[PDB]
Write a protein that binds this ligand. Sequence first.
Ligand SMILES: [Mg+2]
Ligand SMILES: [Mg+2]
Ligand SMILES: [Mg+2]
Lengths: 258, 262, 263, 256
Amino acid sequence: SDLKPIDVEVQAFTSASNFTLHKYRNICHVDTCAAHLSKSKENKEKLQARNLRLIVSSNEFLVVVKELNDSTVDNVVSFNKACAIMSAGVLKHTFDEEFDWKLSKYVKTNNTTKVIPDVKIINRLAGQMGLSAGNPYYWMIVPGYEFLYELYPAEVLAYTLVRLQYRKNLNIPDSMTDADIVSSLVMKMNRIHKLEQTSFDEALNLIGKDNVSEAYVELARDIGSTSKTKRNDEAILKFRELIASFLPALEADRIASA
Amino acid sequence: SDLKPIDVEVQAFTSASQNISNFTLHKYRNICHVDTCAAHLSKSKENKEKLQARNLRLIVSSNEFLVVVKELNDSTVDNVVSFNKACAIMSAGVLKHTFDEEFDWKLSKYVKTNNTTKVIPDVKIINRLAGQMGLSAGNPYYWMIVPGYEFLYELYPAEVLAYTLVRLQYRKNLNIPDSMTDADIVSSLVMKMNRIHKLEQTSFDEALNLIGKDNVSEAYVELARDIGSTSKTKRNDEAILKFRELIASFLPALEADRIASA
Amino acid sequence: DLKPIDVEVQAFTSASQNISNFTLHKYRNICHVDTCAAHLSKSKENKEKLQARNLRLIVSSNEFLVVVKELNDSTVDNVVSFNKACAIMSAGVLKHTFDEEFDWKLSKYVKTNNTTKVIPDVKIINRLAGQMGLSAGNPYYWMIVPGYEFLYELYPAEVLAYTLVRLQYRKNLNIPDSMTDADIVSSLVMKMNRIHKLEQTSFDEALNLIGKDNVSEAYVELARDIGSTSKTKRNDEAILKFRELIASFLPALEADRIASAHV
Amino acid sequence: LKPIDVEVQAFTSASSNFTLHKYRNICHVDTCAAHLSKSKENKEKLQARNLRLIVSSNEFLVVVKELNDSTVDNVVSFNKACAIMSAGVLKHTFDEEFDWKLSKYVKTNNTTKVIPDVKIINRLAGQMGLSAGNPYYWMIVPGYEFLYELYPAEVLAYTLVRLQYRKNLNIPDSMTDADIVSSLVMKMNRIHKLEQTSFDEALNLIGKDNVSEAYVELARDIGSTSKTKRNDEAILKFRELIASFLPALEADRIAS
RNA sequence: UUUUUUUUUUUUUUUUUUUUUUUUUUUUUUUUUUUUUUUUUU
Ligand SMILES: [Mg+2]
Ligand SMILES: [Mg+2]
Ligand SMILES: [Mg+2]
């Protein structure tokens, strides 16, 4: 009754992800990419309606498409992949070490033309953590950061630990479970390390357990430095305190009314 | 009449109105082509979200069709059906060929299926739900692993219960989200069993003795033999434990740094 | 779009316009019992129809109701809101099922003047009462309806008791967890605030005006079979029987793993 | 297969400081007050389309739905529109405004005063015991926290009444105690720089006695009851009653 | 393994109270249905 169907095609699912950040390492203009990352919230909402074309250097661009699980075309990417590509462009000039997976260690990033991202460009996700502009981690705090695990595994894992521990400081909704917070990263770890055969401790030793620690304390140092939940909670305690101070003058006013 | 009211007929809700046409798969035994419905079951997840936006129409054979509609509940004609019952109808179109017997509730016994010549399903068609359980193409149970499989309890009871047992036991292996409690995994089957066995007036053991408990177990081992010993949900669980263990061993350096910081 | 609307400057000064003066006693003898029972049997469907149009509900051979959504005040007796409509027709069945009603002037329950000994049809089923384990023929069967709180005027202890049942057994009644406890009793308290004038009277005073013994009597009547038979009980017993099935099947998977012969 | 071009525009600290002092002499008092009487009405209209409101024959005020910053000084958000208009009436009812440079109250500088017509009704002030004619009648408006710039002790005191008398004023339980004060704490954080200065220093600068005089003025005629107080009192007596009947129900099951 | 999910410094935005009402509104609709969930260990 009063329903228009659509005629679904008879197509069977028959049998038959090469994404690597190393194909986009020298395609980014730093201040262009940082500006796009500074508007990630507005960009994700624009994506919900139409797909987006983002210029990331005066000769290169990306096509951000929703629900894109595969593409032979390199610069057609999902939102998380696009932010990760653009973040890596900035982190090549802020982080001095990157991970070589066949050498199983951190090797120095050789950046001949090393530049400083414009301090004026603000990352509001990073401010929520208490990080200030100029911090080398500043532009790692982006949507889709988990893809950066390919280059910065200790740093990306550390940011994930901070999101797990301080979900309330970062205004993560209590709706989300701890599994959803870490799921994306575990998927990237499982691909790199083969977690079906490997141990987690084997991965935490392959990357620097102390490296994770140093990155963790860098990203965690200034959490709770200024908190609107603690700022509001002191006001309520100070307000209810002043209400109590005002009671004898309120009853003096009502005994005067009678 | 400013309030332009519409008359409403005085029709009382009685169980004679509720049970006018209860659903049964026996009306749909010859409506589906094996390789056509498996192509629709192979794309069940896509169908479900495409169903959300607008309701759907699915050709199952040369002239017979099925219209899928969300939140349908009752309906006065046979080929207009909900998502779960549509997947159940198509599933039974392949299992008539892959399963050698079906249950007869008149006789309290499984009976051999009369399936003329049996057309073996194309092993090119891949059911991803069965692949999560380790099943491969050509397995007879392959196309039983569909949404709304519980409706197949009427034809293949012991096999549908064994699958539900497999989903409760291996819920983390099958990435069933911890949001759903154990009772949620089995709720629909219990409803299917309630209708057929009237569990209000029958025990659980009586049901599992009417159907074959020897049949259930041997379907349980067929469905759980190749279930993987890893999953993303189990990897996520192991990660949360390891991550909190790292967070704990990092707290001294953290607090020592903040007292030294401005 | 992209340009504003000039709003006119006029204030808000006005009167209470309390014109409702709604009492169920205006509709006592206007209802055919089986006609009204049948409209109540389709309450959910009629509310859905009400979202699209105003409704015309014939309640007897000589009377009808006009159901209108968002009906604040109406001067005409026939034009009522949905909650008022179900309450009006529920009272028509309850006059024949319940033997006593409250008289607020005498401050006690008095006998209902049912001259005609009419029973509501047994086959007409109230799904809302079915969710409570009440079977057809129960004298309370037709108080379990949308807008039941209006019946506090006639059956105060029984309407309060059903509200208590909705409070304690909210899970068995499939009431959403997302709705306040206060939201479930909010409208009954509006009724109680009108009849008992709760601004200048206590809840304990009101609970002594109607019978606390009478609220308890109706409570055990309405809550006797709430948990009698549950999905939560059935689905739970299934789990443990399913889990002993599994524990008995584990020697089976193991034997099929390490043994080639039939076991 | 279709994209839209996103232009490179970074979020910077650079991108108009809001001061009510820019709107002190643009409001007729009986017309700015009539807009505040139909504030709930003006509010839902703002989701449909942006609204243009007249403060007087010579000046306009256009309100839009989600303004985080505006180059224009006459397009504002709702809470600022109400505050700009309420301020127009309180310059004639309040006899003192705050000067943050001199760190204390000074006269409101209104040579010729007006008395608002007493028929314009503020239903929000009517939920409390305020009757028309009270000098605080038109401060009880949506967006009052912005008036902390001019009347900080009175605006804080109103916040105190909302905190303690939230049930009396039907503030839903879904609104946190923090949510009631979250907006005012933000206005104070801008003016007082709360990371550096404390609440006690703010309270001493505005006057804890000035707060007290506005408090007893606003909390004087709060009604003893509300729907929310009744519902909350009913739930308790209702949960008392269930317990009192639990023996009787168990006895009934044992009998049959 | 992708997809997907969530966080957006500060001010803002937003949120809430509507002449202490009554109404309106809201929620439950037997059993079954609906709903829900897993998607080739990715
Ligand atoms: Mg924030
Ligand atoms: Mg039900
Ligand atoms: Mg009102």
